[PDB]
Design an enzyme around this catalytic site. Structure first.
Site, PDB file in Angstrom:
ATOM      1  N   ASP A 120     -21.898  15.938  21.895  1.00 40.38           N
ATOM      2  CA  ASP A 120     -22.233  15.863  20.484  1.00 40.38           C
ATOM      3  C   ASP A 120     -23.137  17.046  20.174  1.00 40.38           C
ATOM      4  O   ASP A 120     -23.602  17.751  21.074  1.00 40.38           O
ATOM      5  CB  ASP A 120     -22.912  14.532  20.150  1.00 40.38           C
ATOM      6  CG  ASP A 120     -24.207  14.323  20.931  1.00 40.38           C
ATOM      7  OD1 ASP A 120     -24.135  14.086  22.156  1.00 40.38           O
ATOM      8  OD2 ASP A 120     -25.297  14.400  20.322  1.00 40.38           O
ATOM      9  N   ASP A 168     -26.556  18.028  17.582  1.00 37.38           N
ATOM     10  CA  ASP A 168     -27.649  17.478  16.787  1.00 37.38           C
ATOM     11  C   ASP A 168     -28.341  18.584  16.012  1.00 37.38           C
ATOM     12  O   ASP A 168     -28.682  19.623  16.586  1.00 37.38           O
ATOM     13  CB  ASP A 168     -28.660  16.768  17.691  1.00 37.38           C
ATOM     14  CG  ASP A 168     -28.005  15.743  18.563  1.00 37.38           C
ATOM     15  OD1 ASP A 168     -27.406  14.815  17.990  1.00 37.38           O
ATOM     16  OD2 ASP A 168     -28.015  15.891  19.800  1.00 37.38           O
ATOM     17  N   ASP A 171     -24.727  15.003  14.447  1.00 30.92           N
ATOM     18  CA  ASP A 171     -25.812  14.259  13.825  1.00 30.92           C
ATOM     19  C   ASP A 171     -26.617  15.213  12.955  1.00 30.92           C
ATOM     20  O   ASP A 171     -27.070  16.261  13.426  1.00 30.92           O
ATOM     21  CB  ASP A 171     -26.723  13.609  14.870  1.00 30.92           C
ATOM     22  CG  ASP A 171     -26.033  12.497  15.642  1.00 30.92           C
ATOM     23  OD1 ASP A 171     -25.064  11.912  15.112  1.00 30.92           O
ATOM     24  OD2 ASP A 171     -26.468  12.208  16.779  1.00 30.92           O
TER      25      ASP A 171
HETATM   26 MN   LIG Z   1     -26.233  13.158  18.619  1.00 32.45          MN
HETATM   27 MN   LIG Z   2     -27.028  14.888  21.395  1.00 29.40          MN
END
Ligand SMILES: [Mn+2]
Ligand SMILES: [Mn+2]
Ligand SMILES: [Mn+2]
Ligand SMILES: [Mn+2]
Ligand SMILES: [Mn+2]
Ligand SMILES: [Mn+2]
Ligand code: NA
Length: 325
Positions: A193, A195, A249
């Site tokens: 992912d 961020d 995110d």
């Molecule tokens: Mn994340």
């Molecule tokens: Mn992360």
DNA sequence: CGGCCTACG
DNA sequence: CGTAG
DNA sequence: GCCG
């Protein structure tokens, strides 16, 4: 060797990789069974090994290390003697462990949901796809995109995503800034992912920003899924002749809170749990990603930097790449 | 023995 | 219940 | 599971 992970540098790569991985299997298994205490001990023991300056070669070297008791010491002893630990291997091959790992790695599915599905007899992703009325929208997205979301995110991906986030942020609020956080800020070359933390130098101008950012990313066709201060998205990332889904995110903080939010969102997860535990138990201060509170004076600590926060906790500063607990 | 981080969506 | 580091 |  200090007892809290925030008291010691932990690099991304180290000298006890195999030992730490085995302890982390037992930690994960404990979480699947609801034992957060045993998860924490196994995670902390693994992290101690990550912080050692050289390989553990003999059981004598565990003497006096924090978080090594009878159980974690025996795991290391077996790996040193035989190259494998029967308990770890039993966990690894167990139907419970493999299925809980598969289910909980779905976006939208936690231990509680995975456990319920396991008890209902479900075992595979196609099992879940056969009865889609039972799923949340979040889970439907996590399942449709599961294959892409299982594929490592590379640094080149990250750079491309940061440019498109900055373009939307620039239109949403001129002067707002975008900072890469999470594992990539700690020096990881890959991740699952990405961020980002967004702020603006004029306190209060960040109010209302995330909806405006999301609306603009949506209008560019880049949002495959979204549901404010925190947005958990699935982005469409261009690839050669195609694209892939990527979890992103997006987090907004006012500049007054930015050092706390940067610290919190840079992690690691264990590092931040340990830092908050240290703050409260050793210093009597309450820490989160918004601030640091003295509950005796009833005052919040002003911070202009992460360095400020380490100083206010009496800790030697650790750069992000040494927070890989 | 109690504690185990502390938030937001 | 899920999400986050 | 381990620490204080
Ligand atoms: Mn994340
Ligand atoms: Mn992360
Ligand atoms: Mn035991
Ligand atoms: Mn043996
Ligand atoms: Mn807030
Ligand atoms: Mn007890
Ligand atoms: Na999940």
């Amino acid at each position: 060797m200090p007892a809290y992970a925030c008291q010691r540098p932990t690099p991304l790569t180290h000298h006890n990789t195999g030992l730490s991985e085995a302890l982390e299997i037992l930690a994960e298994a404990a979480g699947f069974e609801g034992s957060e205490g045993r998860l924490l001990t196994f995670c902390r023991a693994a992290s101690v090994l990550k912080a050692l300056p050289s390989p553990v070669t003999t059981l004598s070297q565990l003497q006096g290390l924090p978080h090594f008791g009878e159980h974690s010491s025996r795991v290391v002893q077996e790996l040193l003697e035989h190259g494998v630990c029967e308990e770890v291997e039993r966990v690894r091959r167990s139907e419970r462990y493999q299925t809980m790992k598969l289910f909980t790695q779905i976006f939208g599915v936690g231990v509680k949901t995975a456990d319920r599905w396991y008890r209902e007899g479900l075992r595979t992703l196609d099992d879940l796809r056969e009865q889609p009325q039972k799923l949340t929208q979040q889970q439907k997205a996590g399942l449709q995109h599961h294959q892409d979301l299982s594929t490592p995110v590379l640094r080149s991906d990250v750079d491309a995503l940061q440019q498109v986030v900055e373009e939307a942020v620039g239109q949403a609020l001129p002067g707002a800034t975008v900072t890469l956080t999470g594992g990539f800020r700690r020096g990881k070359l890959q991740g699952h992912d990405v961020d980002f933390l967004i702020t603006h130098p004029k306190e209060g101008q960040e109010a209302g920003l995330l909806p405006r950012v999301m609306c603009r990313l949506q209008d560019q066709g880049l949002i495959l899924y979204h549901q404010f201060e925190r947005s958990f998205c699935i982005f469409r990332l261009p690839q050669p002749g195609s694209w892939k889904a990527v979890r992103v995110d997006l987090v907004v903080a006012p500049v007054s809170q930015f050092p706390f939010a940067l610290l919190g969102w840079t992690g690691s997860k264990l590092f931040q749990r340990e830092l908050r535990r240290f703050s409260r138990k050793e210093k009597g201060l309450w820490l989160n990603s918004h601030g640091l509170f003295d509950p005796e004076q009833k005052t919040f600590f002003q911070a202009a930097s992460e360095e400020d926060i380490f100083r206010h906790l009496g800790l030697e500063y650790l750069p992000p790449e040494q927070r890989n607990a």
